[PDB]
Structures are given as C-alpha cells and as structure tokens.
Amino acid sequence: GYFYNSSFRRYATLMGDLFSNIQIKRQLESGDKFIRVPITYASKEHFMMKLNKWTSINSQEDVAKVETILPRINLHLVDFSYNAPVVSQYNPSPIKMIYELSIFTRYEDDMFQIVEQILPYFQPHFNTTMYEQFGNDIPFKRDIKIVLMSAAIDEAIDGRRRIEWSLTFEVNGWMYPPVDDAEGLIRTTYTDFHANTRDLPDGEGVFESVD
Amino acid sequence: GYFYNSSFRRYATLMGDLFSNIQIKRQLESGDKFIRVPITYASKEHFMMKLNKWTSINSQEDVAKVETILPRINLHLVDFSYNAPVVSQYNPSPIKMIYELSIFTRYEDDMFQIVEQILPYFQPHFNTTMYEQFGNDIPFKRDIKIVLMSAAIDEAIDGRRRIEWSLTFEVNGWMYPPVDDAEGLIRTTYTDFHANTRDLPDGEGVFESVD
Amino acid sequence: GYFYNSSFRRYATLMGDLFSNIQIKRQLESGDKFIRVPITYASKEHFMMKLNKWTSINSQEDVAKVETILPRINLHLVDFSYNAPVVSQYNPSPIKMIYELSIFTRYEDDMFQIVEQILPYFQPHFNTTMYEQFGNDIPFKRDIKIVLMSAAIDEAIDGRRRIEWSLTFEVNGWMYPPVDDAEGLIRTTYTDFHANTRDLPDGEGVFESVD
Amino acid sequence: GYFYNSSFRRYATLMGDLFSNIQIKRQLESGDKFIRVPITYASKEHFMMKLNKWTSINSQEDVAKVETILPRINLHLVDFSYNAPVVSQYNPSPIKMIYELSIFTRYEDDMFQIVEQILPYFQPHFNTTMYEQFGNDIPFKRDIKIVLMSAAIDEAIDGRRRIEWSLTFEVNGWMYPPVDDAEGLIRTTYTDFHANTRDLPDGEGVFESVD
Amino acid sequence: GYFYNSSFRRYATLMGDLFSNIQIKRQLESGDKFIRVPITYASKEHFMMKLNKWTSINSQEDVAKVETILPRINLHLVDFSYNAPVVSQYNPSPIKMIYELSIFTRYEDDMFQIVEQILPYFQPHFNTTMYEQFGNDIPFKRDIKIVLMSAAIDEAIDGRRRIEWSLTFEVNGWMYPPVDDAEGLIRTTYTDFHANTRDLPDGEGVFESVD
Amino acid sequence: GYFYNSSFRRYATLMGDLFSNIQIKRQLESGDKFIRVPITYASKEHFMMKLNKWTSINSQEDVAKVETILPRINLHLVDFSYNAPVVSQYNPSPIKMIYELSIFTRYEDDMFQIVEQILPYFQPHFNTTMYEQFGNDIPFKRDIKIVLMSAAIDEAIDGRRRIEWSLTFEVNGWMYPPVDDAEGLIRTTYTDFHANTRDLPDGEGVFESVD
C-alpha cells in the first residue's frame, strides 16, 4: 500500500534512521534509565496539532501519561531543487533535498543531550555512502552528502512547558524514475555517523506512526 | 468557439500533454489498480474554489466519490516576458512563459509517485523539438527549452486532508501574431520526455474541464 | 475645454491609438463575428469602480447588456522621469513615461487573442517615428522608443468572473513647455505596428469616455 | 514675528517663488480665462486636513466656491543632510535639502498644464545663481543646484474627485549660523527658469496662508 | 545617588552641554525676548509621555502655562558598539555611541532658528578635544569626533500642534572600567562649537529634570 | 538530574560565570552599599513572564520587596552553527554559539555601572583559555573567543518603570559527542576578564533559579 522503491521514501527513511538511535539519560533512585527518542515523519503543522492532542489533559490517567510523550523528534521534507554541479536512471539525476528535523523536549537537559548527539557529526557536512542493489545485480554506489544548514531555537509556554529546536539539513542525493515494486524490491545499505555499514530498515520500522 | 491557432493555447496544451499521462499505482485485494491523474487548466484560486466545492460531502454517494477526486493536477500560466538573448512571424519572437503545475493529493505516497515521474527529466532543463506545420507547407522547427525553476510544498488540514506541491516551470518559447483559423488549422507535433514524437492533441483532449 | 497641444495628451493618445484597433473573433451560429476592443484613459482605481458599477446586475435588460461590456482595455500614466542617456523646446527634453495597459476579459480566449495581437511587436522594444508640425513649418522628427517592461496576471471571481492582465510600457519620448492652442494646433503623425504612417486622431476619437 | 534671515526660510521661499508664477488656461464661452495656481508651505498631512475642510459641502454658498479651491500646490521640506563633495559662515557649509512639491487638481488637463510648465526645466537638474547681500557689502554668490529626484502619481475619489501628483526635489544649497535681523536684513536675488534675475520676494507674498 | 565618574554619564553630559546654550529670538511689542531651549535626557517614549502630561490643560492656570513648555530638546542614547579602527583603561577602548537629539517646537520659525544653530557645525563631523584629569595627575586627552548621521522630520497635529525634528549623532569616544567616585572625582573640560574651552558642568546643571 | 558533562551546559556556565561577579554601588546615609547583580539562565520570554509575576504589586509586603528584584541579568542561548574556519571528539568540532545577555534595571545609573563593567573587555573580542580535564587525565586546552556582536536598548513603562539593554555574544567554541557522567566528571578552569584562572563553578552556583 505504498510505492516501496520510491526515491523520496528512501531519503526519508535514511534521514530518519540516522536519527533513530538517540537516547537520553534520566537518573532514578534505583538507577539510570536510558530512554529512546521516538521519531515521526509528518508535515510540521500536522505533527504539532496531533502533539497538542496527545499533551491534552482529559482525565486522571492522562496526568501521568503526559511525560512519556516528550521528548520526540519530527521529520519532514520541506524543499527540493536540481543540484547544479543517453537516458536518465543510474546514470541518475543529482537532486538536492531539504529536511526539517524538529526536536521537542520538556527539559533543556533533554535537548542538550539529544543535540549533542547530533551536532558534532556535521562539519558542516557529513558524508554517507549508500548502496542500492536491484534484485541481484551489482549494487549501485551513491555518494550522499548531508549538510547542516541552520538551527532555530524556540519555545511555547503555559505556566512549563515545551522546548523546540529545529535543524535544517541539505541532502545532496539522487533522483530517477520509479522502478516498479513488481520488478523487485530494492536492497539498501548505508554508512552511519561512525562509518558503520547498517542496512536501511523498512519505513514502517523507523518512524512511529502519528496516525 | 476558440482561437485554435492561438500561441498561448498551444503552449498550454503542450505543457498539459507532457504531464497528461501520469499514473499512480494503488495496491488492492484483487490486484494492483493503476489510476490516471486528471489534469486541468485554470487559475489556481479558481481551481481551489471549485475543489472545495467538490470536496464537500453533500449526500451519501459523495462520501465515497471523494477519493476519486484526488489526486489531480492543475496547470496555469502565471507570468511571461520577452526573452532577451524585418516584420514578425516565423521569423517569430523569443518569448518566455512561466507555468505553475499544481499537484494535489490525499496521500504522501501518491505525491511521491507522481513527482518521481516528473522531476528527473529536468536537469534543470528539458529540451523538446516542436514542429508546427501550416496547412500543407513545410513545418517550422521551434526549439523549446523547459526549465524547472522551483518547487513549493504545502498542506491544508481538517482532522486528513490534502497535500499540495507546486512546480514552477520556465518555457522558453516562441510568439507571433494570430494566424486566423480560416487560413487553416496548425498541425503540431513534439518530442516527449523520451524523445518520442507524439503529435499535440486538441485542447479538449488533454484537460478535463473545471467547468 | 482642454489644452490640445499638451505633450502628455499627445503621448496618451499615441499609446491609446496603437492599441485602438484590436478585434477579437467570436464564432456565432450565423457566422464569425468580429468585435473591437474599446479603450479608455483613466486612473485604474476609477476605471474598476465604474466597471463594477456597470457589471453589477441591477436588472434584466442588464443581464444581456453585461457581456457587451467586456472585453476592454484601460490605459493610464503611472510614472515619469528625466531620461538620462540654448533654451528648452525643440531642442526638447528627453523624458521617460510609464504606462499601465490593463486588459479585462470574461474569457481566457479573448485575452489570448488580444495579447497575441500586442506582445510580438515588443522585442522588447517597438520603435515609432513621430512627426509634429507646428502650423505650417517643417514638422519635427521625434524618435519614440516604447519598451515592454513587464506583465502581470490576475483574476476577480464570483461563481465566473473576470480575467485581468496588465502590461507595463516604458515610452522614451520628449517634453517641452506648453505651446498655446492659440499659436496654432499641432499636426501629429506616426508609424504604427506595421510602420504605416497614420496621423494621430483627436483624443475624443481614440478613447471611449469613462464619464 | 519670524527670523527674517533664516536660511531655511530663504530656501523655502526661493523654491516657492520659482513655482509661484504658473497659470492654467481655462476656456469659457465669453473667452479664455487664465488662472494662477496658489502655493502654500505646510506639512503635507496638515495641508490635506485643511483641504478636506475647505472642499466639504456645508452649504450652497459653498457649492460654487469649491472649484476656486483647486488647483493648488503645497510645498514642504521633508529631509536634509550634509552634502559630502577657519570658522563657519561664508565660507559656509554645503547642505542638501529635500522638498516635496504637491500638485492637486480636479482635472487631468489642469495637471498636464502645470507639470508641462515644470518638468522640462529639470534635466535632471536646474541651476540658479543666487545673490545674497548683507546690508551694503558685496553680495555673496551662491550657486544653487536643484535636482528633480522622482515623481509620484495618485488619486482620492468620491463618485469626481481629486488628482494628486507630487514632485521630489533635491536643492544643493548652503547653510550657516543665524545672522540676526538686527544686524540688517538680507537682500536676495536669483535666476528663474529663464535666467531672468528676479529678486526674492518676502515670504508673505509668495505663499498663501494655510492658516 | 549616582556613579559620578560614569563614562556613559560623561558622554551624555558632554552632548547635553554642547546643546545646552541655544536660544531663540521671539519678537515682542516691548522688545525682543530671547528664550533658552531647555534640554532633557530621557527615553523618547518617556519624554513624550511626560510632554503630553505637561501640555494637558486640566485647569485655567494651565491655559497660559502651557505655551511655555515648547520649545524643548530631548536627548538620549539609542545605540553603541565597538569602534573598529596591555590591560584596559587609559589606554582605553574605542567605543562608538549613538545619540538621538529631538527638537520639539510649536512654530516652524522656532525650529528654523534652533536647527540653524546646530546644523552648520557638523561637516559632517565636529571635532572636540576632551580633557579628563584624575585627582591631580596629568589630564588625559581623549579625541572625540561627533558625526551628524541623519535627520528626521515629523508632526503631531490637533486642529496646531507640534513639530518634531530629530538629529542622529555618532560620537566616536572612549570607554574603560568604572573608576570609583571614592578614588576621587574626575575633572573634565572640552572644546565647544567655537573651540572655546569650557569645562564639563555636573549633570544636574545641564538637563532639566524630566522627573 | 542533569547531564553534568553536557557541552551546552558548560558554555552556559562559562558565560554566566564571567558575568557572575558584577556589583553596583548604591549610596546610603550609613555608607555605600555594594549589591551583586543576580543572573538567570532562561529563554527570554520565560524570564520576562516570571519577572512580570514578581513585579506585580499585590500587597504591602510586596511594595518594598520591589527594588530587590532589579537589577538583574538573564542569559540565554539563541543560535548556533558550525564554525567554518579520524573520528570526532577531542579532536572536536569548531562550533559557534550565540548568547543574549539581558540586563534589566530600574535606574539608568544601575545600567551605566553594570555595562561599564562589561563593555570595555570586548574589543570587539575577548579571549579565554579553558582547561577541561577528564577524571585525572592530562587536561584539554580549548581556546575560546567570545565576540561582542551588537547591543540593543529598550524600555517598558508605567508612570517608572524598567530599563532593558541586551548584549549579543558570539562564543567561538568546541562541540563533541556526550561523554557519560559515569565515565568520570569533567574538571573545568578558565581565565576571567583579568586573566585570572578561576575554576568553573557548578551550574547550581552561578544561576539563581527562575523556578
């Protein structure tokens, strides 16, 4: 029920999965608890609407169930353009994609931990080699440059309430016409922030559903 | 009831027809269904008005027939200017025309499919050779450069509701004074995204009528 | 009841008259009908007010009489400045005058026809030699460059309603102090869009009255 | 009841007087009537307030007296700055003064007449030699350059009503500390638009009082 | 009740005092009256509040009293920044300070007089040597350049009412850490608009209290 | 209950502590009283809301306790970016951090005293060498350049009421991935405005709690 080999989907999942494995430390009496930051893919307005819905105190079980919601990260595509350096598709087209990575947090410390886990890997760019194999052929080698373009710090108060920092990223990637899922599912690998060659998980696995 | 040989009409139809034959795959229980994206030519404000009129659930048969409406594409001219590099018409005038191609979709996946079918052919430009023959004379050969200028991503929510992406295109074309339909209908051919020589269909054939 | 030899008047009429003789083809049951596009000289705000007064369906004999109103063209001066390349007047002062030519239309087709009759003659400029003779002396030869600067496309809806495209033109002309109508009326000729030497008609002849 | 030798006052009067002597022809049956355009010096907002006060139909004795009010010209200073090319005053300081000259008119024809009498003398500048004599000493020779910087066209409707064009002028003049009226009144002459050496009239003669 | 040796205070007082001694001539029947223009140091908003408070007619004794309030001058610091050309304080730090000098007046004539007394001494700059002696040591010589940056003309009406012109000045001065008033009071002299060496009056002497 | 070795935290504390020790002189009859200006770390809006909560005169016990609140300083991070001049962390990444230092005060004199204690040490930059030791290893030497970028002056009145000046600072520092507190606590020293090597106090000591 979705175009599996979509190039946009692959870039969405790649970006999401780079930021999928981020935890914050939270000290308890019995001991330190490390919690994973759940990440979604959605238009920002959408996400924020639904976030205002979850954070709403409707009953007594909600009062507690409120601090499990934050911290979180929302991801979205916000712009793209041709990337000015016989047919077209591997050899493919140099495209350039703009992503907003929106971190939301109830505690400045939460934010500090998270961003400290992101920010140092972009100087200002972070390279990743991606391998996309078609059926059983030799995989393709796509050089992917991800550039940290800017950051934006903001709040939204009520008495605490909610800290929001947004990073903007430029992916220098590759576009080509759709290759039907029926012609075979694309196998994809990439190098993470430590040059560790992870293989790209399916979409359904990286993003929690806002729905 | 229209000036058939209109230069503007030909550019509207040319653009509309390049993007006329775009389908999205939609996986069903019985098997995959492929649906064509219907295309219109209209002022954007107009299109959106009539679209809000259609999207309104008036009766029970409308509730279903709503997701037959989307996806669609609306096309319009939004600007033109002289294209700065004895009488005038073949030799004609280098003109430059600005088109807004507006894709509306209920599902991110629909969008991904469509744009992946448009975007790779503009690097940033796409050439097409056009042949316009007058009655039975030797056809004229007009070199047409179409350049992808920018993209713009947006929403418009209600609880799903509607994704809207707009591509802006610069057509580098040719203008000349009207040649009366009474002097004979122009025969028009062109090269598509695959250098395949289709001949330009009548207006009534490419655009579904917003009316 | 007006300064006949007014320099501004002469430019208003010249511009008005270049665009005075434009017809659109309108296919009927009995056969093709050609209708002339009527031109007025007025402040834009004004013109649109009176146009909203005329187009308002107050009654039934109006219901029909509404589609005789459109299409039309309103012309106006909007800016002027010294034209940086013993006393003053022939030898006169190089002035530069800015005109807004506003085309209004109920049908996209009407617009296409009209503008296709304007646009090809400005690449980006259109020359005209003007001859202004004083009484019976040797006429003066003023070289007039008219440059097409920009275009602007708009609507104004209600259920159709009205298409509005405005061209902006830079006339590079000549200014001098007023020469009394009592010293004799100035004779003026010019070369039209086909370099055919028409002579400049009186104001009352070119523009229908907005009043 | 005012500092007669005021430098600001002198420039205000020079400017007003260059534009003091302007008439429009107004054709009647009995014969042509020439009317002088009255000029005032006032903040623009002020002038327009009082002008809305005069033009209001309070009675029938007012109804006639309305078309004697327009046309008029309001003049005002709107900016000044040092003019970047032992003590201070002749030798004096190069200053630069900015004037808004505002023409108001009930008929486009009136405007054409007035502005046609102003505009051709600024190409883009108009020089005037000014002679300022102290008591009986040798007059000082101040070269004054007046530059037409821009023009601005506007209306203000009610059913006719009122045309407003504003010229902006850069006077390149001279400033020095105040020379008391008790030390003797300055004698001032200048060259008009025709190099005719008029001598600068007292303020009260050039400007009608808005008060 | 204040840090007497404050560097900011010294610059505020220096500026205030250059403009402390400005009078306007006011011709009366009995004879000419010269009135000194009172100067305050305050935030512009503040000053205007209190000015509206003074100018308000609450009783009959106010009616007369009210027309003595204008003319006046309000002064304030509005910006500062480092002034780009072993420890720090004589040798001290080149700072640059921005002052708004705001002249308010009921009569154009009053304004003309005042500004004619300010404006000519800035071409565009006015130099002044300042001497700050510590206890009994050799005085320090600080070169102070004051530059006239821009001017701004405005009104505020009611039936007269009030003229407001503002000069903006860049003082190129010197900052250093605070030298306690207990370590001895700094003695300060400077050169006025005529290179005449006045010594800096205490704050309380230059500015009338807005409080 | 916070990531002690957080880099953002260290820079917040470094900045806060350079400005931790600022006093103003306040003359009493019994003798001069020196009061330390308290510093907080908070988003500006937050600080201002809570400041409006403290400044509200609710009772008589509140009326006195008003002038103990001011003066104060609020500090916050407002922007950051890569600082464009085998793995990453000491060797670490050149980052650039933007801080808004907001000084609030009831008296101009208070402001003058404070800012005079800050401003002279930034010409436009101030260097500090920081030593960060991990457990017991050899310290790291991070060169920290703090640049004064701009200042901004404002009020907020009610009859006095409150002066607000804001300095903006560019810290040219260093980022690296989080080093767990469990791996040992970081020891930090730095050179203050006088090259005095103080050691960085814990967060809890520098900032008063806004909560």
SS3 state of residue F110: helix
List of residues 6+ apart from F130 with CB closer than 8 A: F14, F141, F142, F143, F144, F188, F189, F190, F191
Burial class, C141, CB count within 10 angstroms (exposed 0-12 / middle 13-18 / buried 19+): exposed
Whether cis (ω within 30° of 0) applies to the bond prior to B161 is yes
Nearest to E103 by CA among E26, E51, E172, E56: E51
Rounded distance between C-alpha atoms, residue F96 and residue F78, angstroms? 11
Rounded distance between C-alpha atoms, residue A14 and residue A41, angstroms? 12
Among C67, C118, C123, C193, pick the best mutation site for testing chain B contact (most B Cβ within 10 A).
Answer: C123
List of residues 6+ apart from A12 with CB closer than 8 A: A41, A75, A77, A203
**What is the secondary structure of chain D as a DSSP string?**
---TT-HHHHHHHHHHHHTTS-EEEEE-SS-EEEEE--EEE--HHHHHHHHHHHSS--SHHHHHTTTTT-SEEEEEEEEEEE-----SSSS-EEEEEEEEEEEEESSHHHHHHHHHHHGGG-SSEEEEEEEEEETTSPPEEEEEEEEEEEEEEE--------EEEEEEEEEEEEE-----GGG-PEEEEEE-TTS-EEE---HHHHSPP--
D20 with D33: CB under 8 angstroms?
Answer: no
B184 with B134: CB under 8 angstroms?
Answer: yes
Residue E97 pairs with which residues in a beta bridge? E80, E171
Structure-block tokens of residue C138: 């040797």
Residues 129-148 of E with CB under 8 A from F: none
Structure-block tokens of residue B202: 């009548």
Q: Could you report how far apart the first and last alpha carbons of chain A are, in Å?
A: 15
**What is the secondary structure of chain C as a DSSP string?**
---TT-HHHHHHHHHHHHTSS-EEEEE-SSSEEEEE--EEE--HHHHHHHHHHHSS--SHHHHHTTTTT-SEEEEEEEEEEE-----SSSS-EEEEEEEEEEEEESSHHHHHHHHHHHGGG-SSEEEEEEEEE-TTSPPEEEEEEEEEEEEEEE--------EEEEEEEEEEEEE-----GGG-PPEEEEE-TTS-EEE---HHHHBPP--
Q: Provide the resolution (angstroms).
A: 16.0
Q: Is A113 on the interface with F (CB under 8 A)?
A: yes
Tokens 């004879």 belong to which residue?
Answer: E31
Residues 153-192 of B with CB under 8 A from C: 175-178, 180-182
| DSSP state letter for A4 | T
Strands A125-134 and A186-191: antiparallel
* Sign for the pseudo-dihedral over CA of D87, D89, D93, D98: positive
What angle in degrees, to the nearest 10, is found between the helix axes of B7-18 and C108-118?
120
Q: Measure CB to CB from residue C3 to each of D109, D119, D151 and give the nearest one.
A: D109
Q: Spell out a b/e string for A60-91, using b for 16 or more CB atoms within 10 Å of the CB, else e.
A: eeeeeeeeeebbbbbbbbeebebbeeeeeeee
Rounded distance between C-alpha atoms, residue F56 and residue E140, angstroms? 47
Which chains reach chain E with 3 or more Cβ–Cβ distances below 8 angstroms?
D, F
Q: How far is B184 from chain C (nearest CA, A)?
A: 15
HSE-up (13 A, CA, CB side) for residue D207: 21
Nearest to A166 by CA among A156, A151, A177, A180: A151
List of residues 6+ apart from A150 with CB closer than 8 A: A167, A168, F81
D6 with D173: CB under 8 angstroms?
Answer: no
List of residues 6+ apart from B84 with CB closer than 8 A: C124
Nearest to F96 by CA among F86, F77, F82, F114: F82
| DSSP state letter for A108 | H
* Sign for the pseudo-dihedral over CA of F12, F15, F20, F22: negative
Chain centroid offset of residue B56 CA: 26
Interchain contact D/C (3 or more Cβ pairs less than 8 Å): yes
List of residues 6+ apart from C23 with CB closer than 8 A: C34, C35, C36, C37
C92: left (phi over 0), alpha (psi -120 to 50) or beta: beta
Structure-block tokens of residue E9: 């205070």
Among A116, A146, A158, A196, pick the best mutation site for testing chain F contact (most F Cβ within 10 A).
Answer: A116
Q: Is D49 on the interface with E (CB under 8 A)?
A: yes
E14 with E130: CB under 8 angstroms?
Answer: yes
Strands C140-154 and C163-175: antiparallel
Rounded distance between C-alpha atoms, residue B105 and residue B38, angstroms? 12
Chain breaks in chain D (C to N over 2.5 A) after: 85, 159
Rounded distance between C-alpha atoms, residue E51 and residue E68, angstroms? 12
Rounded distance between C-alpha atoms, residue D53 and residue D48, angstroms? 8
Set of chain E residues whose Cβ sits within 8 Å of the Cβ of F105: none
Chain centroid offset of residue D46 CA: 16
A16 with A206: CB under 8 angstroms?
Answer: yes
F39 with F74: CB under 8 angstroms?
Answer: yes
CA-to-CA dists, residue A89 to A135, B109, E49, F197, angstroms = 16, 20, 70, 61
SS3 state of residue A206: helix
Q: Measure CB to CB from residue D155 to each of C1, C45, C89 and give the nearest one.
A: C45
Q: Which secondary structure element, helix H or strand E, spans residue E96, and what is its range?
A: strand E93-105
Rounded distance between C-alpha atoms, residue F118 and residue E95, angstroms? 13
CA-to-CA dists, residue C117 to A13, C21, C41, D211, F198, angstroms = 53, 10, 20, 55, 81
Q: Is F2 on the interface with A (CB under 8 A)?
A: yes
CA-to-CA dists, residue B8 to B21, C147, E192, F139, angstroms = 21, 21, 73, 73
Rounded distance between C-alpha atoms, residue F26 and residue C124, angstroms? 74
List of residues 6+ apart from E15 with CB closer than 8 A: E75, E99, E101, E146, E169, E171
CA dihedral E116, E120, E122, E126 (to 10 degrees): -110
List of residues 6+ apart from C171 with CB closer than 8 A: C11, C14, C15, C96, C97, C98, C99, C144, C145, C146, C147
Q: How many CB atoms lie within 10 A of CB C105?
A: 22
* Sign for the pseudo-dihedral over CA of E134, E136, E138, E139: positive
E184: left (phi over 0), alpha (psi -120 to 50) or beta: left
Strands B197-199 and B186-191: antiparallel
Rounded distance between C-alpha atoms, residue E12 and residue E20, angstroms? 12
Chain centroid offset of residue F69 CA: 17
Q: Do E113 and D9 touch (CB under 8 A)?
A: no
Q: How many CB atoms lie within 10 A of CB F126?
A: 19
A90: left (phi over 0), alpha (psi -120 to 50) or beta: left
* Sign for the pseudo-dihedral over CA of D87, D91, D95, D101: positive
Rounded distance between C-alpha atoms, residue E186 and residue E133, angstroms? 6
Burial class, E86, CB count within 10 angstroms (exposed 0-12 / middle 13-18 / buried 19+): exposed
* Sign for the pseudo-dihedral over CA of B56, B58, B63, B64: negative
Rounded distance between C-alpha atoms, residue D160 and residue C46, angstroms? 9
Q: Do D153 and C79 touch (CB under 8 A)?
A: yes
Q: Which secondary structure element, helix H or strand E, spans residue F72, and what is its range?
A: strand F72-82
A46 with A78: CB under 8 angstroms?
Answer: no
Rounded distance between C-alpha atoms, residue B44 and residue D128, angstroms? 57
SS3 state of residue F23: strand
Interchain contact A/D (3 or more Cβ pairs less than 8 Å): no
A124 with A178: CB under 8 angstroms?
Answer: no
| DSSP state letter for F114 | H
Whether cis (ω within 30° of 0) applies to the bond prior to E91 is yes
Rounded distance between C-alpha atoms, residue C104 and residue C166, angstroms? 9
Fold of E2-211: STM4215-like (3.30.2000)
SS3 state of residue A59: coil
Q: How many CB atoms lie within 10 A of CB C30?
A: 6
Q: Do E113 and D178 touch (CB under 8 A)?
A: yes
Nearest to F189 by CA among F48, F18, F3: F18
Structure-block tokens of residue F25: 């002189």
Angle at C74 between CA C68 and CA C77, to 5 degrees: 170
Q: Do E77 and F148 touch (CB under 8 A)?
A: no
| DSSP state letter for E76 | E
Q: How far is E102 from chain D (nearest CA, A)?
A: 15
Angle at C192 between CA C191 and CA C194, to 5 degrees: 105
E36 with E23: CB under 8 angstroms?
Answer: yes
Q: What ranges do the domains of chain E cover?
A: 2-211
Q: Measure CB to CB from residue B46 to each of C119, C150, C157 and give the nearest one.
A: C157
Chain centroid offset of residue B1 CA: 21
SS3 state of residue A127: strand
HSE-up (13 A, CA, CB side) for residue F16: 26
Residue B189 pairs with which residues in a beta bridge? B131, B199
* Sign for the pseudo-dihedral over CA of D11, D16, D21, D24: positive
Structure-block tokens of residue E77: 């610091």
Q: Measure CB to CB from residue E93 to each of F115, F123, F152 and give the nearest one.
A: F123
Nearest to F13 by CA among F117, F97, F86, F110: F97
Q: Method used for this model?
A: cryo-EM
| DSSP state letter for F207 | B
List of residues 6+ apart from B137 with CB closer than 8 A: none
3-class SS letters over chain B: CCCCCCHHHHHHHHHHHHCCCCEEEEECCCCEEEEECCEEECCHHHHHHHHHHHCCCCCHHHHHCCCCCCCEEEEEEEEEEECCCCCCCCCCEEEEEEEEEEEEECCHHHHHHHHHHHHHHCCCEEEEEEEEEECCCCCEEEEEEEEEEEEEEECCCCCCCCEEEEEEEEEEEEECCCCCHHHCCEEEEEECCCCCEEECCCHHHHCCCCC
Rounded distance between C-alpha atoms, residue C144 and residue C200, angstroms? 14
Structure-block tokens of residue D96: 């630069």
SS3 state of residue A143: strand
Q: Is E25 on the interface with D (CB under 8 A)?
A: yes
Set of chain F residues whose Cβ sits within 8 Å of the Cβ of E45: 155, 157
Nearest to B167 by CA among B115, B96, B209: B115
Set of chain F residues whose Cβ sits within 8 Å of the Cβ of E177: 116-117, 120-121
* Sign for the pseudo-dihedral over CA of F179, F180, F182, F188: positive
Residue E14: what residue type?
L
Q: Measure CB to CB from residue D81 to each of E32, E150, E163 and give the nearest one.
A: E150
